[PDB]
Amino acid sequence: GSPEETLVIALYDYQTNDPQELALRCDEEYYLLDSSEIHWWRVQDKNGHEGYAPSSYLVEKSPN
């Protein structure tokens, strides 16, 4: 139970001002797309919104 794609949780409320970054909410989670990364982790909201998200300000939820 861990197909490349997974979910993440934003530790802190990180608000952005660009369509490249995705607005994050504390306690909220998102759909992880690019995890192999080295640069910026892509995330997608259940609302169809996507953007970059600091991997440092979140943690892998990993479904059991």
> Up-side HSE of residue 42: CA atoms within 13 Å toward CB?
12
Contacts of 35-43 with CB under 8 Å at 24 or more apart are 35/4, 35/5, 35/6, 36/4, 41/8, 43/8
Bridge partners for 60 per DSSP: 8
Type of residue found at 46: K
- Characterize the bridge pairing of strands 6-10 and 58-60: antiparallel
Domains, the chain, with CATH or none: 1-64 (2.30.30.40)
- 46 to 38, 39, 56: CA distances (angstroms): 25, 23, 21
Structure-determination technique? NMR
